[PDB]
């Protein structure tokens, strides 16, 4: 599936099976734009988290209960949700995916 294939491709499951990962089907320019949108608190108290005004197409890849390295396995869940990201630096850009509301 797409998630086994994408996780492979991006070096996310070559030396370890990453439990969860979300891929955003939007232009980089448009996800970077989220850092200047709705400011919200992060799960850890900090407030350098922002929520997109709109929903974006995303694919969540959850590892199964059975999957073990080196044979990783992912459940593919496609959706459209408001992404929540944390931003840092200049230019202020996303560095961490905080969630999908």
């Amino acid at each position: 599936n797409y998630c086994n294939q994408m996780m492979k491709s991006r070096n996310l499951t070559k030396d370890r099976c990453k439990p969860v990962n979300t891929f955003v089907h939007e232009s980089l320019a448009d996800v970077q734009a989220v850092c200047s949108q709705k400011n919200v608190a992060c799960k850890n108290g900090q407030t350098n988290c922002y929520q997109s005004y709109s929903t974006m197409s995303i694919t969540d890849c959850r590892e199964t209960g059975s999957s073990k390295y080196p044979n990783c396995a992912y459940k593919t869940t496609q959706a459209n949700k408001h992404i929540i990201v944390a931003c840092e630096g200049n230019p202020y850009v996303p560095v961490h995916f905080d969630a999908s509301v």
Partner: peptide, 15 residues
Amino acid sequence: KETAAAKFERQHMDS
């Protein structure tokens, strides 16, 4: 290695 903004893009972007 790579910066945090680069890793984010490699891990989460799929335009």
